[PDB]
Structure 1
Amino acid sequence: EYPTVSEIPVGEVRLYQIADGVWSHIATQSFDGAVYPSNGLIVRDGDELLLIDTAWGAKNTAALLAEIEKQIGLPVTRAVSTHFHDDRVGGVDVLRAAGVATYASPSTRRLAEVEGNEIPTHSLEGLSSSGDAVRFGPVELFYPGAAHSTDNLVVYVPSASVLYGGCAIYELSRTSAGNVADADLAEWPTSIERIQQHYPEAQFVIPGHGLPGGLDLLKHTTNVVKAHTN
């Protein structure tokens, strides 16, 4: 049903429709010689589209654009990157050049600049304190606290009870810690519990990499992070 790493060639993107006017996008990328899948979101807002995350590099993000055009055929006008790493902002220049207004928090923009990663143009205000939520069209954006990265946002689509966790939330397949050099391991579980307290109504939970699940992915992630800590 949900597209899998093993069914997606590196360079192609697939869409999965989760509800009316809500899709995930799935791509794959090589990292240290393994192949990973990676998810983002697409959310309809009237006659245009809001994109959440790039598809992890220029080539994948151009493909995502063409796949959106062929399967949905609405224009992407805005995009939000959920943190500063390349699976979230790699492709921002491609988006900018297609006339998409690219957004991320000041924090994310700062960290991307330092890192040498592509920098979203626009700044999302009101997200600097743990627990902050802002409305961004047909979604709510939430800063739960440091976890996978200090700047990690999550995204909730109230219309469809879809919570998009990005890299702060692990799929059930991942049973040891992923890529954590920029992580706040000590605060990651407190951050997830903020997510649980703010979106206890979420039905469909999407991790940054892999298959979606329910609110159990939050508990799963907490288990994996505490086991890594120990």
Structure 2
Amino acid sequence: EYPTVSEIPVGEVRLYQIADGVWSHIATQSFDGAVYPSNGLIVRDGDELLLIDTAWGAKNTAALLAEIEKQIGLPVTRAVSTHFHDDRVGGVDVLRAAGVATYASPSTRRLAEVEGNEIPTHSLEGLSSSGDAVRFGPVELFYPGAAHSTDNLVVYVPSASVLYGGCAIYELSRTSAGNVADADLAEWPTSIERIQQHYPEAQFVIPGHGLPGGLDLLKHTTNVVKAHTNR
């Protein structure tokens, strides 16, 4: 059963097997007086592991590495952060210290710096324009355009038809907007439609926060976003 927010004390990290060689990682952290769960991805990359997003903070990200070592036992050699917020780059300094090469797009690295957040070391080329996709080991990185943030990326695992939507995709049970200070509400539905067109074969869809679903989460997120804008 996929772990829920109340089952994960702040500071602990769970791994969840999605498919052969594909895991989500789930952690918890406080934001504006409440604790929320947060997802990222782990993908086998030959004899190495590719990490998608930190576990939202240095302490959680340290627990993430320890849980990977305990449960999987292959080295995390690269990490991609899918936008500049703390649930994605919070913990980059820990990863770097542990020997992980950290990556993000130029926009993400720039926005992280502006915001005073941790900054991934290496720039990802080829993601500057809505609709751009690049291969990165066992995954494809896709920039769908502005949504939850102007820089948000999504990640697809072809070997397993896993789409990691990050914070641009909402879980089914989430019905209000939330952390949209940095969003482009008007562009968010268009960006989601690019995701639908590019990954129509996605079997598992992982939101940035909450329970995994299918492509139904895409239409679901667009409804929520609109409702926020309507009023």
Q: CA offset at residue 173 of structure 1?
A: 1.4
Cα deviation digits, residues 170-207 of structure 1 (max 9, x gap) = 00111010200000000000000000000000000000
Q: CA offset at residue 33 of structure 1?
A: 1.3
- The secondary structure found in structure 2 opposite 1:217 is helix
Distance 2:204 2:68 in 1: 22
- The secondary structure found in structure 2 opposite 1:206 is strand
Distance 1:2 1:165 in 2: 17
Q: CA offset at residue 32 of structure 1?
A: 1.1
CA RMSD of aligned residues (A): 0.4
TM-score by length of 2: 0.99
Cα deviation digits, residues 95-144 of structure 1 (max 9, x gap) = 00001000000000000011100000000000000000000000000000
Structure 2 residues not aligned, in runs of 5+: none
Matches within 5 A, 1:62-81: 62-81=62-81
For 2:225, the equivalent position in structure 1 comes to 225
Q: Give identity over the alignment, percent.
A: 100
Structure 1 residues not aligned, in runs of 5+: none
Alignment of 1:22 with 2:22, yes or no, is yes
Cα deviation digits, residues 34-72 of structure 1 (max 9, x gap) = 110000000001110000000000000000000000000
TM-score by length of 1: 1.00
Alignment of 1:124 with 2:130, yes or no, is no
Distance 2:194 2:177 in 1: 20
Distance 1:178 1:142 in 2: 24
For 1:112, the equivalent position in structure 2 comes to 112
Distance 2:30 2:105 in 1: 27
- Length, aligned pairs only: 230
Distance 1:172 1:6 in 2: 18
Q: CA offset at residue 156 of structure 1?
A: 0.2
- The secondary structure found in structure 2 opposite 1:51 is strand
Q: CA offset at residue 24 of structure 1?
A: 0.2
- The secondary structure found in structure 2 opposite 1:114 is helix
